[PDB]
C-alpha cells in the first residue's frame, strides 16, 4: 500500500515522503524528523486548510497519493 | 529593487496564517532594533513596534494583552494544540518571567490588537528563509519581527527609502 505525498516546508523546500494510508500523523512527523531534523512536537502538518491531529491516519483526512501538504513549525516557545 | 516589498506573494496555509519565501536580505529593507536576550524578547520586540516611548519594561503590557488574547482564542488556536496545557496552566507559564514567546502568541495578539504580525526567520545569515504572517495586512502596515537562532526575536522597521 506504499505511496508518496509531497510536503512543502515553511522555508520553501518540497520533500517527498514514502507513506501508507494507515500511517498515523505521528508516523508521518517521525518520517519528517528523519529527513529534516524537526522534532515532531514542533511540527504543524497541514492539509487543505486543516492542521492534522496526532492519533488520526492519512486515510481519515482523505489524503490520497500525490497529495500536497504543508509543514509549518513553531518559532520560539518552550 | 526599490519596490521589492510591494511584490511579496503570500499564500494562505490555514485560516489567517500566510507564508512567503522571498529571496532577500533583512538588513537591505529593514532597520533591525535589537532586543535583550532575556527570554522576554518576543514581547520586547512587539512593544518596540506598538508602544510609544518603549522601555525595557513595556513588555509587561504586551504580556497582559497576550493573557487577554489567550482567554478569547487559546482554546481554538491550532498551534495551542502543540502546547498541550489547559488555558489556566498555559497562562501561568506564559506570564512567568523569561518564558519564551512564539508564533502562538503572535497569532493571538494579532487578533487581540487588531494588527498584522509578520515573523521573518533567518538562520545565521542576513538571508530570509521564510515569512509567516498572522492577519491580512501587508508588510507596510504589519508589525515585522525577526526570528533568529532558536528563540531570539528582534523588532524590524521598514527603511524609509522603500516607502
Ligand atoms: Na500560531
Ligand atoms: Zn518590569
Numbering used by the authors:
A (entry chain B): -1 to 76
B (entry chain A): 0 to 162
Task: Give the original sentences from the paper that presented this experimental model.
Here we applied protein engineering technology to target virus-encoded deubiquitinating enzymes of two viruses with significant impact on human health: Middle East respiratory syndrome coronavirus (MERS-CoV) and Crimean-Congo hemorrhagic fever virus (CCHFV). This resulted in the rapid identification of ubiquitin variant (UbV) inhibitors that bound with high affinity and specificity to the viral deubiquitinating enzymes. Strikingly, coronaviral PLpros also act as vDUBs to suppress host antiviral innate immune responses by targeting cellular Ub-conjugated substrates. The CCHFV vDUB domain is located within the large (L) segment of the genome, and has also been explicitly implicated in the evasion of host Ub- and ISG15-dependent innate immune responses.
Conversely, structural studies of nairovirus vDUBs revealed resemblance to the ovarian tumor (OTU) domain family of DUBs. Similarly, crystal structures of CCHFV OTU were determined bound to CC.2 or CC.4 to gain insight into how they selectively block the DUB and deISGylating activities of the viral protease. CC.2 and CC.4 were bound in the same orientation as Ub.wt with similar buried surface areas of ~1000 Å2. Interestingly, substitutions in these UbVs were concentrated in the C-terminal region and only substitutions at position 68 and downstream were found to interact with the enzyme. In both UbVs, Tyr68 improves hydrophobic packing with Thr10*, Val12* and Val18* (asterisks denote amino acid numbering of the large segment-encoded protein of CCHFV), relative to His68 in Ub.wt. In CC.2, residue Leu70 projects further into a hydrophobic cavity in CCHFV OTU formed by residues Val12*, Ile14*, Val18* and Ile131*, than does the equivalent Ub.wt residue Val70. The conformational freedom of a Gly substitution at position 74 enables the C-terminal tail of each UbV to form numerous favorable interactions with the enzyme. Residues Gly75 and Val75 of CC.2 and CC.4, respectively, occupy space on the CCHFV OTU surface, which in the case of Ub.wt is occupied by the side-chain of Arg74. This alternative conformation permitted by Gly74 in CC.2 and CC.4 allows the side-chain of Trp76 or Trp77 of CC.2 or CC.4, respectively, to pack within different adjacent grooves near the CCHFV OTU active site, with Trp76 of CC.2 forming a cation-π interaction with Arg92*, and the amide nitrogen group of CC.4 residue Trp77 forming a hydrogen bond with the side chain of Gln149*. Conversely, Trp71 in both CC.2 and CC.4 does not interact with CCHFV OTU, but instead packs into a hydrophobic cavity within each UbV.
